[PDB]
């Protein structure tokens, strides 16, 4: 039933062009039926053309399967050699070997699914052609060629699977098949695995509660402690989580193998539904805290505990040691954060750079944390922490840019490729220069030093430079657009995965606008350029920054899947 | 990966005992492996015993398959004869063609069920014998499968596939004028039972509506804590939403326990509402109800009177049930409209299971009708201040007894149709006890105002008939609706020989709740029908009506279970 949709869902994206073109055959058959008027000879010519196309597709499938089988055999040979060397040596090496064996088993299972689906598609398309043409020649062709095709009559893959299982059990697992087939099973992958019904119900419940609480908050607002600054970080984090769930959904639908790019376990992937559930729960907590602050239902309890607890809970949620509430994902995130914040002492993989960029787009959270620290230290001259700026504010603002710059320097050291890493480092240090000049101008504003205009002009120049640098890097390098190989997709690259180019153009325009918007937001937040409306401008701009980062994540992951722009894979 | 769960979720419940006992074989193999210590002799003995059980199961499967194949052949012959007669005959003809098409679809579905039975039994045999071979590290289970299972009649007979082909041909030729696509659009059988999970968007909508409902309920409670009787106006809506939610739970429980309500209710198996859709409808209606009540409490718009908010809600509900367009569950809405029309005109239609079941549901939802009549009285008179809440009249009693009247007339029609007096007349008397209780309560209430001197006699008669009605309804529920307290109980004390639900504690708690809430239901009907409690009657009725809905929910559970097990309602040949 609807074999085309099932095939499309179960097709491995990396081999999309190497599967059976079921839709093309369906379109050919329908066009032939529509154009049928001499009738017998026309039908004979159409049958000949269809058989030729089927033969071409069968040859393509056979050659692809043969090459993949040879690759699998070579991989098995090298893995066996590595296992023999490890045995001759006789813990971490054993773990790495087990991971490699699981990956090889996944590749074998993918090959088996490829051959099975190709055979099923051949059978289905031949049956459909026979039904439409009211002729039995399709079954004869299938039996003559497809039934005896090498891709369908090769059991070398099942034998490889059996040998891999036996080797894993006897050597790595110490002769117990029960331990094997776990981490070595390859459950349903991709869109072929519907999310749990309970997860979807929880996502819906959290979304509804969040919507109602947001409506209540809006009505209450329309009808001692700065709540905007405190809650902006939480709101931005919740928005980022929701937009990241959307990013994951789009990557799964667009065929972008973000699992491989992020070096995540293919057998256990946190679905977009789980991200939506986490975002909804965090938003529910955030809304409850804000409502409690507005109303103060408990008189004895102070108001300040309401935010402090909320974020604290989130912290306790992230650093929870109990194996519950996405414990594996939380531990992976904690390790990634530790690597990122200690960037110069670790290998900069794709995940580290991506999370550093996310932090760069989430510097408002760090700024709000520093502002809260200042408010607690001093305010508890009115508003001293807001009217006057200091160096620590600038350093906190530049911390994400510092992390990215040091990551780029480490990448340059590792690979010695000057051009990309050094250009990116300059593109991140433009931020240091801009923030430094803005802080100098703000500090000199209070004390007339006769050089305020010089610093203002320097800040404007470096603002323009940084905005142009970031925009050019995003459009040309992160997204790979404006390439010279665009045969038809003007201002884009030759290959695009997303259905519409209008998405690409809208993303280009929104990035152009929002890079300047975010640069303005950084300039306002890190100093006192606009003490009157600065807070509201930053609050309005930060969600726009998160949205820009979400679109950038979309297109950067697309480019990474299409091309090794980040050079994170051999 | 786990054939036990797949088999349990894919077995046809009506044939539950006719499938391979995969779980029993698993337990047997595990026990034998655990007791393994001489050793080879014990292994051989266990293998012999296990294979003897295998032959017994294979013989059972073959016999059942042969019986069902003979039944299918006879059904096909009868359908062919009927179709030939109809063709030779050529508004009644249109109905005859529709009925023949439905019968052919049902027979094709039975053929698909038999084919699924065959495939599942073969897969279970192969998977259990493979597990036995792996456990015993011997290549003999596969040999026995090849020698016996692979050559058994239930797997060496292709007559079911041939019958399926002939059914397709006949439906496509002499019932569809040669349009094969039209035939396959109705004969093809999608997954059944819990095989197909509900759509993700439907579950998300259910969750969203549940969350909105919860938050709005919390807001309503907070507003209440910190010109129009709102309790008597919104009780009907709240009870209807609760009843729909509990009905979704009932459908989920029937699906999980294997109670084939799709066949009991004569619903279309190829497409029927799941518990998720009922939850979604209940959540949306609850959202609307909560919004209306919040608008009443706050009145955000001053130009719009408060009375507009309730009415519109209920109006929308009506518009949500009689919507001509095919937009929102139109199939189920039209089926419910037809069932309601049949129930409210009971003495002119044959009483099927669905009609009696819906009449009973209404019997448990009489509070809605009472509230509607009270609001009619309020609008007629109040708009003595509280004249419609201080005295009782005949129309009030008639409205209270309307559902009981429908059930009683249905029982009388069933007696007139089947001519068996015992069950139908006992049930008719059970329902007429409600008439007697209501009328005596009304007489006492209307006589308590003037010194007729016969008030205490009416009060005593009302007490006697209240006890009589409570006992009658309880005995019918326990002995004639749930099929409990039977003489065939071997280990399920106070229950029947076969119980489909996992826990007997459920049955015991259901009996206790049935007793308590039957008495509560009788008390609430007495209080609401007439003055009786003139100050606390409304609160007691409001508290008890949800309890009546819960009682009707448990009763639905156990009545459907008993109907699936035994033909208690005699709605099937
Ligand atoms: C000042 C710092 C501000 C906080 C830092 C910023 C953001 C934190 C949140 C998310 C960033 C990580 C996104 C990774 C996306 C990769 C693509 C994908 O979606 O793939 C997912 C990534 O899932 C993850 O691992 C983690 C996802 C994030 C879960 C959210 C946790 C709570 C967030 C709130 C933090 C509270 C902080 C308090 C405030 C300071 C694959 O999931 P898996 O289960 O296969 O994971 C791998 C597990 N193996 C390797 C065992 C299979
Ligand atoms: C006294 C005042 C009014 C009292 C309340 C009235 C009615 C509610 C009671 C029961 C609803 C039916 C429950 C289904 C029982 C069978 C099991 C099952 O789940 O069967 C369902 C039937 O679904 C239903 O019928 C609909 C479910 C109920 C939805 C509620 C709609 C809104 C109601 C508004 C209330 C109006 C009052 C105005 C306010 C004052 C299977 O669906 P299918 O699609 O297979 O249907 C068969 C369709 N073929 C045969 C063509 C394929
Ligand atoms: O008679 P119909 O027209 O109602 O259904 C036929 C046809 O539909 P069609 O006319 O193209 O719309 C098939 O394609 P389809 O609509 O699902 O869709 P796609 O074009 O592939 O997207 C359908 O499923 P499938 O072959 O694609 O999986 C298949 O069902 P069924 O007997 O169960 O086949 P089995 O899987 O059990 O072998 C029937 O094939 P025939 O046996 O040759 O008559
Ligand atoms: O499977 P591995 O062998 O590659 O890695 C496993 C290993 O951790 P390592 O990497 O060596 O530090 C286990 O510790 P270990 O050596 O004492 O014992 P074992 O021989 O494995 O039993 C640990 O506890 P445990 O679960 O097995 O008891 C388990 O945690 P995890 O399932 O998350 O947590 P739970 O929710 O199940 O508690 C790891 O599972 P993965 O990370 O999913 O692979
Ligand atoms: O756990 P492992 O990996 O060491 O061995 C598992 C494997 O047995 P294997 O080696 O082929 O003999 C599964 O077969 P599989 O999917 O490959 O399929 P094929 O039949 O070959 O196509 C079998 O599933 P099942 O399909 O028979 O239902 C599963 O049974 P389990 O979950 O208990 O479920 P049930 O007993 O309730 O059915 C076994 O697990 P355990 O018995 O728990 O240890
Ligand atoms: O349920 P039914 O079979 O007893 O009755 C069907 C009948 O109309 P009715 O309801 O009896 O007045 C169809 O046309 P008809 O009179 O020529 O007679 P036949 O039934 O063919 O003899 C009608 O087709 P249409 O014009 O809408 O496409 C279809 O409408 P609708 O529910 O929207 O269903 P869909 O077709 O959109 O799926 C009805 O449901 P179904 O066929 O089950 O689907
Ligand atoms: C602000 C103005 C100028 C432009 C705003 C354009 C926004 C709406 C554009 C920018 C990038 C776009 C996204 C790019 C990729 C995908 C993945 C696809 O599988 C679904 C649509 C989705 C999620 C797009 C939705 C629309 C989108 C978010
Ligand atoms: C407090 C007392 C008096 C109420 C009576 C006990 C209630 C809790 C009992 C009575 C009947 C019971 C139900 C009977 C049948 C099923 C179907 C099963 O698949 C899941 C549990 C479920 C849904 C039970 C839940 C508990 C239940 C509702």
Structure overview:
2 copies of one chain form a homodimer. The relative contact order of chain A is 0.06. Chain A is mainly alpha-helical and 570 residues long. Chain A folds into 3 domains: 3-186; 194-341, no CATH class; 345-570, no CATH class. Chain A has helices spanning 3-10, 22-35, 39-89, 92-133, 137-146, 156-172, 197-222, 227-254, 258-261, 272-295, 305-318, 327-341, 350-360, 363-379, 384-387, 391-415, 418-446, 452-478, 501-526, 534-562. Chain A has 20 helices and no strands. In chain A, helix 12 crosses helix 13 (350-360) and helix 17 runs antiparallel to helix 18 (452-478). Helix content of chain A is 74%, strand content 0%. The longest helix of chain A has 51 residues, at 39-89. Residues 253, 256-257, 501, 506, 509-510, 512-513, 554, 557 of chain B line the site of one cholesterol.
The counted number of beta strands of chain A is: 0
Number of helices of chain A: 20
What does the overall shape of chain A look like? elongated
Q: Strand percentage of chain A, roughly?
A: under 5%
Bound small molecules, deduplicated: 1-palmitoyl-2-linoleoyl-SN-glycero-3-phosphocholine, ligand I8P, cholesterol
Percent helix of chain A:
over 70%
Order of helices and strands of chain A: HHHHHHHHHHHHHHHHHHHH
**Oligomeric grouping of the chains:** homodimer
- How far apart the termini of chain A lie comes to 41 Å
Number of domains of chain A: 3
Largest sheet of chain A, described in full?
A: none
Report the radius of gyration of chain A as a whole number of Å.
Answer: 29 Å
Largest interface: A-B, 19 and 18 residues
Which structural class should the secondary elements of chain A be placed in?
Answer: mainly alpha
């Amino acid at each position: 039933m609807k074999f085309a949709e099932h095939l499309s869902a179960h097709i491995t994206p990396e081999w999309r062009k190497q599967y059976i073109q079921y839709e093309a055959f369906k379109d050919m058959l329908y066009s032939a039926q529509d154009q049928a008027p001499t009738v017998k000879r026309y039908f004979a010519k159409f049958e000949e053309k269809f058989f030729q196309t089927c033969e071409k597709e069968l040859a393509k499938i056979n050659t692809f399967y043969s090459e993949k089988l040879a690759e699998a055999q070579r991989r098995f040979a090298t893995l066996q050699n590595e296992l023999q060397s490890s045995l001759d040596a006789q813990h971490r090496n054993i773990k790495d070997l087990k991971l490699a064996f699981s990956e090889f088993y996944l590749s074998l299972i993918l090959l088996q699914n490829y051959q099975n689906l190709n055979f099923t598609g051949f059978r289905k398309i031949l049956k459909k052609h026979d039904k439409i043409l009211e002729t039995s020649r399709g079954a004869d062709w299938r039996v003559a060629h497809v039934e005896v095709a090498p891709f369908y009559t090769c059991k070398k893959i099942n034998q490889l699977i059996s040998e891999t299982e036996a080797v894993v059990t006897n050597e790595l697992e110490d002769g117990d098949r029960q331990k094997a087939m776990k981490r070595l099973r390859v459950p349903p992958l991709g869109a072929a695995q519907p999310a749990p019904a309970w997860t979807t119900f929880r996502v819906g419940l959290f979304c509804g509660i969040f919507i109602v609480l947001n409506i209540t908050l809006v009505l209450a607002a329309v009808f001692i402690w700065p709540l905007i600054r405190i809650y902006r970080g939480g709101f931005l984090l919740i928005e980022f989580l929701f937009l990241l769930g959307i990013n994951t959904y789009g990557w799964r639908q667009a065929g972008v193998n973000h699992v491989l790019i992020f070096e995540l376990n293919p057998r256990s992937n946190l679905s977009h539904q789980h991200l939506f559930e986490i975002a909804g729960f965090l938003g529910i907590l955030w809304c409850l805290s804000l409502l409690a602050c507005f109303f103060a239902p408990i008189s004895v309890i102070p108001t300040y505990v309401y935010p402090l607890a909320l974020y604290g809970f989130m912290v306790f949620f992230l650093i929870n040691p109990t194996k519950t509430f996405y414990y594996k994902s939380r531990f992976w995130l904690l390790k990634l954060l530790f690597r990122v914040f200690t960037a110069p002492f670790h290998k900069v993989g794709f995940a580290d750079f991506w999370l550093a960029d996310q932090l760069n787009s989430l510097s408002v959270i760090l700024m709000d944390l520093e502002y809260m620290i200042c408010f607690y230290s001093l305010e508890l001259e009115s508003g001293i922490c807001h009217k006057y700026t200091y160096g620590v504010r600038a350093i906190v603002q530049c911390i994400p840019a510092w992390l990215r710059f040091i990551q780029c320097l480490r990448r340059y050291r590792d690979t010695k490729r000057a051009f990309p890493h050094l250009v990116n480092a300059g593109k991140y240090s433009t931020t240091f220069f801009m923030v430094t000049f803005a802080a100098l101008y703000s500090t000199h504003k209070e004390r007339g030093h006769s050089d305020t205009m010089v610093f203002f002009y320097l800040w404007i120049v470096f603002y323009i430079i940084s905005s142009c640098y970031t925009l050019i890097w995003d459009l040309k390098m992160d997204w790979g657009l404006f390439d010279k190989n665009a045969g038809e997709n003007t201002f884009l690259r030759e290959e695009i995965v997303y259905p519409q180019k209008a998405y690409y153009y809208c993303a280009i325009i929104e990035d152009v606008i929002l890079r300047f918007a975010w640069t303005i937001q950084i300039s306002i937040t890190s100093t006192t350029l606009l003490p009157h409306s600065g807070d509201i401008i930053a609050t309005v701009f930060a969600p726009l920054e998160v949205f820009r980062r979400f679109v950038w994540n979309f297109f950067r992951l697309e480019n990474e899947h299409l091309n090794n722009c980040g050079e994170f894979r051999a």
